[PDB]
Structure formats: C-alpha cells, structure tokens
C-alpha cells in the first residue's frame, strides 16, 4: 500500500522488505491505531472529557512509551490548526 513507501522511507539506502515483512508491518500498524484509540478512550475517560482530544492521544502516546512521536504530531497539529 502506501505502507510500502512509509517503510522504504524509514529504512536506509537500498534496503528491501520482503512481502511478509511489509504485510506484518501493515497488521502491526492496524493494531496500533485500534490500541491507541482504545487507550485514548480510557485516558479521555479518566481525564473526564466526553470526547477524545488531540491532547488525550498525545498523552496516551507518551504514556504508551512513544514520546518520540509527540513533538512532530504537535508540530503538525499546530500547522494543521492554522490551515
């Protein structure tokens, strides 16, 4: 899919990914979204909010050990809100 480029974008020059590796990465990314959604719900639930917010997901991300993610997503939200 578009996962093919995202992958070969994250990998060094001339690297290759077998069709099983990509498939696996695809399933992995799918469980990730469901998992982060699920967890954001819980955090949004413990944080009182009736609705999941941009900060409920960014907090879940970091609470789920993917704090690296946050800085860009915040840089993106900031640019996303202006447009």
């Amino acid at each position: 899919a578009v996962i093919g480029r995202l992958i070969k974008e994250a990998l060094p020059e001339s690297a290759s990914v077998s069709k099983e590796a990509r498939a696996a990465i695809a399933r992995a990314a799918s469980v990730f979204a469901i998992f982060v959604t699920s967890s954001s719900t819980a955090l949004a639930h413990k944080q009182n909010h009736k609705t999941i917010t941009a900060k409920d997901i960014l907090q879940t991300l970091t609470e789920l050990d993917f704090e690296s993610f946050v800085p860009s997503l915040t840089q993106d939200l900031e640019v996303y809100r202006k447009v």
Binding site: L6, A10, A21, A29, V31, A33, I52
Partner: protein, 65 residues
C-alpha cells in the same frame, strides 16, 4: 462516548504512519544496525516485537514463526 473529531481523525492518521516508520526502522536497526542495503524479513519484525517492551501489544499479531 462522544464523537470523533477531524483533528483526531488527523492525529490518528499522522501517528500511525509515524509508527509504520518506527516499527520498520526499529526492526532494521536492531538487525543490521546502520549497514545499508539489507533485506528486512518477518523474523526481524517479530524480533523487535519480542524485544522492545513498548511493542508487547503486538506479540500476538507479529508472533515468532
């Protein structure tokens, strides 16, 4: 449960693709470090998923064959 905002559809899409890059990269880096031009296989993905603790939710999705 409330509704799902665009800002969220957006943020969710944005971080999933960061995770695709993360899992791929992490899997390669843990196998071939920085060495370029290597071939990534399923073993490498199930290897980091069995290593990195922040990836334990994927133990059943990316098991070790």
């Amino acid at each position: 449960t409330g509704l799902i905002t665009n800002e969220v559809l957006f943020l969710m899409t944005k971080c999933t693709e960061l995770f695709v890059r993360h899992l791929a990269g992490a899997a390669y880096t843990e196998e071939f470090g920085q060495r370029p031009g290597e071939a990534l296989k399923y073993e490498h993905l199930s290897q980091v998923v069995n290593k990195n603790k922040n990836l334990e939710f994927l133990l059943q999705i990316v098991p070790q064959k």
